[PDB]
Design a protein around this ligand. Structure first.
Ligand SMILES: [Mn+2]
Ligand SMILES: [Mn+2]
Lengths: 202, 202
């Protein structure tokens, strides 16, 4: 069976409390993430050879896929990729920026504090559903950008280092309309070691 | 004071229970709707003469507004218009389709049941944040379409008859990911008399 799979949550559903509630983690992972994978797999039944692409390859080739599934794949491979990434980039363990990522952040933003302010603002200003991202060019240059819906920096040949889901389903149960509190709290669970790995893998 | 105003909710905050929860009505009206109006007003301080436009006029002229506020107005006048419309198009009173609207629905969709199935499906398939609409051309022809974010049929010279908010903030507290249940329940609170007025005002 070479269909796409939901990656099991890498920690307990209540591991990110009190920053993200257990109920949200259950819905977010077991309903939302699950639905993107299911829909992706269903769309691909017509072209089974596409099961042999990685999520990245699908996302890097949206404009050359068969016209009749291009949009579905964009949305659902996007959802599948983004959520796998998002759950991996959070952790109950305490982590901090180190090594080349730590240096790159200081270099490209001036300081970690300045980077964090810019990131929070970009995340706050996303209008509608979307994501805020710290991304790297192939040469390791860092910047912050956002994508709408389940669109991914990957489709623009940018490499995601960290990323924050600001779809309302990611924060509404606990924060309601207060996305700023969500964004601020989320920095307590960012997995900086996983971010470092993402940056090294360029 | 000719600034744009939040229209007070036309019924009690718990009037739509058990279809829409009181907590959501409070947040939706007092936080979300309120924020669109505030942001609209703030953007317009630079061009105070625009306070003399109606919401419709702003939305019908997004492409000719001064470049530096066009997007903000699109988003926030859209939010202000859509929500005023949405709260008006729901009611605790029992209503049903009648007169010319009732006839138009049968004419353009075959039956009320067929219209409802198509509407529910369009609302279910909105990807990301958006709205489903029953709209009329100037000659009274009916169709169903959707807009993303706070975009409005008004900007395409279509007249909204009824419309459903499918931003996740509109249903997440009570329905979580189960948008289908939200959509199905919402038909119990649709104000068909207000819809008739909307259709007559062509
Ligand atoms: Mn999500
Ligand atoms: Mn809304």
């Amino acid at each position: 069976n070479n269909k796409f799979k939901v990656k099991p949550l890498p920690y307990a559903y209540d591991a990110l409390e009190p920053y993200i509630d257990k109920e949200t983690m259950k819905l977010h992972h077991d309903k939302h993430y699950q639905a993107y994978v299911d829909k992706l797999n269903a769309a691909l039944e017509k072209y089974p050879e596409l099961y042999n692409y990685s999520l990245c390859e699908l996302l890097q080739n949206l404009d050359s896929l068969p016209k009749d599934i291009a949009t579905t794949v964009r949305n659902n491979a996007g959802g599948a990729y983004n959520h796998k990434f998002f759950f991996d980039i959070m952790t109950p363990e305490k982590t901090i920026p180190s090594e080349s990522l730590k240096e790159a952040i200081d270099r490209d933003f001036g300081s970690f504090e300045k980077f964090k302010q810019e990131f929070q603002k970009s995340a706050l200003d996303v209008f509608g559903s979307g994501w805020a991202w710290l991304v790297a060019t192939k040469d390791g240059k860092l910047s912050i950008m956002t994508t709408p819906n389940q669109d991914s920096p990957v489709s623009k040949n940018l490499t995601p280092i960290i990323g924050l889901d600001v779809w309302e389903h990611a924060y509404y149960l606990k924060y309601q309309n207060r996305r700023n509190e969500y964004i601020d709290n989320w920095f307590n669970v960012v997995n900086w070691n996983g971010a470092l790995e993402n940056y090294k893998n360029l």
